[PDB]
Amino acid sequence: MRVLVGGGTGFIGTALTQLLNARGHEVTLVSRKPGPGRITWDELAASGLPSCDAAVNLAGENILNPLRRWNETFQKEVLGSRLETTQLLAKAITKAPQPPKAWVLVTGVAYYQPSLTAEYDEDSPGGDFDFFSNLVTKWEAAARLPGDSTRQVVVRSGVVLGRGGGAMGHMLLPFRLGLGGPIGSGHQFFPWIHIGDLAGILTHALEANHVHGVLNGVAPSSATNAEFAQTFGAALGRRAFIPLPSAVVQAVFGRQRAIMLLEGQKVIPRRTLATGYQYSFPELGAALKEIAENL
Ligand SMILES: NC(=O)C1=CN([C@@H]2O[C@H](COP(=O)(O)OP(=O)(O)OC[C@H]3O[C@@H](n4cnc5c(N)ncnc54)[C@H](OP(=O)(O)O)[C@@H]3O)[C@@H](O)[C@H]2O)C=CC1
Numbered sequence: 035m036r037v038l039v040g041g042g043t044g045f046i047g048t049a050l051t052q053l054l055n056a057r058g059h060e061v062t063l064v065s066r067k068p069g070p071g072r073i074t075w076d077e078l079a080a081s082g083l084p085s086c087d088a089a090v091n092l093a094g095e096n097i098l099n100p101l102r103r104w105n106e107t108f109q110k111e112v113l114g115s116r117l118e119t120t121q122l123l124a125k126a127i128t129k130a131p132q133p134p135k136a137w138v139l140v141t142g143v144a145y146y147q148p149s150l151t152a153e154y155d156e157d158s159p160g161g162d163f164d165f166f167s168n169l170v171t172k173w174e175a176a177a178r179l180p181g182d183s184t185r186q187v188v189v190r191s192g193v194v195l196g197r198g199g200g201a202m203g204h205m206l207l208p209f210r211l212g213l214g215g216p217i218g219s220g221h222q223f224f225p226w227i228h229i230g231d232l233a234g235i236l237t238h239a240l241e242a243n244h245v246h247g248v249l250n251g252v253a254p255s256s257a258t259n260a261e262f263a264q265t266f267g268a269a270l271g272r273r274a275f276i277p278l279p280s281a282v283v284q285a286v287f288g289r290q291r292a293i294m295l296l297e298g299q300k301v302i303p304r305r306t307l308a309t310g311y312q313y314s315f316p317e318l319g320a321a322l323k324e325i326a327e328n329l
Contacts, residue, residue, distance in 0.1 A: 037240060038086040038134070040064040040119055041093030043072075045199035046140065046191075049233040050090070057237060062086065064093070064123070075122060083126040088136040088240045091177070093119035097291065098201065104288035113169060120176040127184055138187040138239045139177040140232075143225045143252065145170040145190055148297035150221065156190075156248040156305040165290055187239040189232070191251035192301060196229030197325055205266075206325075214267055215276035217283060220260030223298030225252045228315035228324065238311045250303040257318045259298065265318050269326040 037054055039047055042063035051061045062084060063072035073084060083089075095108075095115040102108050120139060127133050144166035146154040154160070161171035174188055194200050208214055227235075232251050239245045257265075267274025284292045315321035 035059045035087045035240065036085065037061050038064060038084065038089040038123075040089070040091040040123055042090070043067075044092055045196070046194060046229065046232060047092045048199075049196065049229045050092070050236055053230075053233045053237055054240075057241075059240075064119075075119065078126055079122060083123075083130040083134070085132070086134050088134050088138070089123060089127060090138045090140070090236060090240070091120050091123050092140055098204070098287075098294070100204070100286055104291055109165070113172070116169065116173050117176045120173060124177055124179060128179060133184055135243070136185045136187065136240050137177070137179065138189065138236060139174065140189050140191055140236070140251070141170045141173050142166065143190050143192050143250065143299050143301050144294065146299040146301060148222070148293060148299050150223075153300045153302065154250075155302045156250050164293065166294065185243060185246055187245055187247065187249060189235055189239065189249045189251040190301075191232055192225030192227050192253075194229050194232050195226055195321060195325060197328055200229070202325060209266055209272060209274060210270055212273040213276055214263055214270075214272065214274035215278065216260045216263045217278045218259070218280045218296040220258060220263065220277070222259050222296060223300045224257040224259045224262045225299055225301045226255065226257060226262070226318070226321075227251050227253050228313075228321040230324075231313050231315055234314065235306060235309075235311055238309060242309065245309045247305065249306040249309065250301050251306070252301045252303050253313060253316050253318070253321065254303055254307065255316065255318050256300065262318065266322050266326075269319070269322040 037059055043065050054061050065072045068074050095111045145160040147163055161167045263274045280296050283295050
């Protein structure tokens with residue numbers, strides 16, 4: 035198969051590319067910057083969709099980035115970067131003469147209302163109660179193709195844990211130094227997935243032609259944030275006793291982003307499991323042990 039990966043230079047994208055190649059597929063990236071093995075957004079809009087059997091979009095301004103203040107400008111970039119790139123790919127697919135057989139988008143579990151009691155699956159309602167839930171709705175809308183010529187999948191992802199980027203990029207050194215611990219009360223649900231398993235789900239979506247619709251990109255786990263901190267400390271052989279108060283996380287990230295850190299959704303990957311996909315790292319300990327033992 036030949037796969038076009040929008041935003042594929044990134045964290046998830048790099049893992050997805052390695053797995054796709056390993057499984058016998060050719061990959062072309064869409065990127066803001068030109069180069070080998072890739073085309074630019076400007077080029078896609080100009081001359082259209084290159085030959086491909088399947089397409090994925092991962093493109094997005096980084097949300098968690100502590101170096102940017104949560105203002106309206108940054109908000110506009112978070113939203114615009116995702117809708118525009120997604121829409122551009124969608125329109126390119128619709129007007130391609132030999133359109134691709136599959137089209138897969140990654141969005142987020144932010145769709146589901148954070149709660150200490152609720153339980154969500156892929157059929158659960160949401161997308162309408164805060165900025166990030168509204169984002170996911172519009173984002174998915176931007177991807178939606180009419181017609182059945184191209185198989186459509188949306189993977190709503192939890193926190194993607196892996197070596198060499200993402201959230202672990204920010205957490206790994208402090209935890210290694212004994213500065214880790216729970217965020218807030220620690221009671222909040224921690225929806226997570228090992229990068230290998232997000233990469234795997236996406237690949238399965240691309241390969242298996244019975245897969246359609248929404249899939250929750252989360253390990254079938256019930257971790258809370260307190261359980262995450264403790265398991266991560268154990269895996270590194272370190273003290274992880276230092277709580278981050280809510281006020282401090284809000285100070286650094288802002289009220290709105292802080293939601294992603296201080297609160298959580300219990301998310302079940304019901305439909306994901308129903309696709310026949312089988313997790314390499316379903317249990318949190320095993321996942322963090324892989325990350326910790328390889329550095
Ligand atoms: N924990 C996680 O990582 C989760 C991530 N997601 C989503 O998955 C997607 C990828 O995640 P991840 O790989 O971690 O993110 P990254 O930030 O590593 O990758 C994003 C890629 O998109 C491109 N990009 C960055 N900013 C912009 C912009 N303003 N406009 C266009 N393209 C941009 C970049 O490619 P280039 O420089 O080549 O243009 C970059 O390599 C994102 O949309 C994100 O919301 C969802 C749930 C969980």
